[PDB]
């Protein structure tokens, strides 16, 4: 039911930390302004992803109790969640309301960005499923935090310590789903359902990057560490 004073504090703190990200307009204005080559689009992708990972590390460090975790587990959580968080943020940006015709042009411009056909349908299928859930900013923020604090990540030594940090975020999100969408009592389950779909992008992320219609696939040293490319 209603959020407690502790949960409201948690929610507002996660919101402020989440709001430090690059604005959706910065990305969409660039894409909608003019059509770029596959080469220019690969560079836009690479800089967007480098800024995303940097901001993600800062958001992750502020997560209550994250700094108390074992340093090797901290690296394993960051590495295991970076691609999923990126796709969750791109899904949020894709679904931000824009003037008439803009979302159709944005979709067509992403389709002709240089990415291989094979990866277009599962990516847009996920974006449209996120869109139908009519998620609030708070839901995206909490869901990102939950993705990062996933105990079921590979190489996690102490799963229980991670579970203790994720549980209060799941409790807040569940209350928010019951408050935002009382007509749909399947909303919380629906949201956790989307998280299971996010994980599939992890498997073929390297191939969707390498299949980009460019001659050279240049990645930054930070991207190489987090994406296991080069």
């Amino acid at each position: 039911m209603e959020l407690t004073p502790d949960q409201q504090t948690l929610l507002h703190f996660i919101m402020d930390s989440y709001n430090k990200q690059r604005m959706p307009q910065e990305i969409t204005n660039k894409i909608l302004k003019e059509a770029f080559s596959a080469e220019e689009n690969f560079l836009i992708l690479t800089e967007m992803a480098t800024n995303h990972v940097q901001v993600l590390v800062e958001f992750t460090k502020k997560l209550p109790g994250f700094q108390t975790l074992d340093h090797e587990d901290q690296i394993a959580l960051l590495k295991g969640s970076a691609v999923e968080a990126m796709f969750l943020r791109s899904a949020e940006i894709f679904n931000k309301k824009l003037p008439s015709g803009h979302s159709d042009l944005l979709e067509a411009r992403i389709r002709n960005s240089g990415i291989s056909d094979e990866y277009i349908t599962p990516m847009f299928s996920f974006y449209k499923s996120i869109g139908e859930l009519k998620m609030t900013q708070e839901e995206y923020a909490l869901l990102t935090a939950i993705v990062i604090l996933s105990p079921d990540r590979q190489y996690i030594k102490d799963r229980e310590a991670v579970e203790k940090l994720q549980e209060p975020l799941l409790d807040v999100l569940q209350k928010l789903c019951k408050i935002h969408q009382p007509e749909n009592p399947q909303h919380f389950a629906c949201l956790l359902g989307r998280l299971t779909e996010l994980r599939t992008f992890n498997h073929h992320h390297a191939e969707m990057l390498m299949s980009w219609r460019v001659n050279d696939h240049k990645f930054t040293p930070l991207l190489c560490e987090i994406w296991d490319v080069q």
Binding site: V57, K61, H71, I75, K79, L222, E225, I226
Partner: peptide, 12 residues
């Protein structure tokens, strides 16, 4: 050295 940049950003 496997996650050198990541370890650095995490510690800082």
């Amino acid at each position: 050295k496997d996650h050198q940049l990541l370890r650095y950003l995490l510690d800082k």
